[PDB]
């Protein structure tokens, strides 16, 4: 097993080469790309999905790795479909929280990011952030 490839690919990461460029060059060279490296670059793809979703709709806040992973898996790695589903899913949750008196101005966008897009965990965090201002104003 010629493990020369992954060490050279790990050189490219050290020098700062783009994973897509490493992959595209290997495919143009007819070289078998090590599946272990592709699988290990999943976090890079999910960060790619998340920031593309942020570019697609500023004002929905930052997208979590958990939300990008669900969209990306559900769309079978189709990058454009994953970003669109990522955006549509988040907009639904921002509206769901909005319907409970928690809009973007109240910090719902940041609570959805901090909790991977779980509406239940975000609602509990937002309730706490309403309770602490009262605790410190009621005592002072």
């Amino acid at each position: 097993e010629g493990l020369q490839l992954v060490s050279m690919i790990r050189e490219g990461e050290a020098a700062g080469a783009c994973p897509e460029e490493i992959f595209s060059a290997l495919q143009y060279s007819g070289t078998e790309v090590p599946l272990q490296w592709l699988r290990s670059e999943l976090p890079y793809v999910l960060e790619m999905v998340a920031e593309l979703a942020g570019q697609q709709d500023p004002g929905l806040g930052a997208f979590s790795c958990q939300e990008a992973r669900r969209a990306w898996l559900d769309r079978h790695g189709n990058l454009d479909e994953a970003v669109e589903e990522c955006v549509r899913t988040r907009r639904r949750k921002v509206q769901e929280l909005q319907s409970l008196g928690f809009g973007p101005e109240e910090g719902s966008l940041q609570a959805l990011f901090q909790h991977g897009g779980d509406v239940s965990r975000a609602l509990t965090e937002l309730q706490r952030q309403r309770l602490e201002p009262f605790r410190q104003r009621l005592w002072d």
């Binding site: 897509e20 992959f23 495919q27 592709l38 793809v45 990306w72 898996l73 790695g77 189709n78 990058l79």
Partner: peptide
């Protein structure tokens, strides 16, 4: 380059699966 990102995403999913 946008084609390269799309290829990478699809390739990484094939590898994962």
């Amino acid at each position: 380059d946008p084609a390269m990102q799309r290829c990478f995403s699809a390739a990484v999913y094939c590898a994962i699966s």
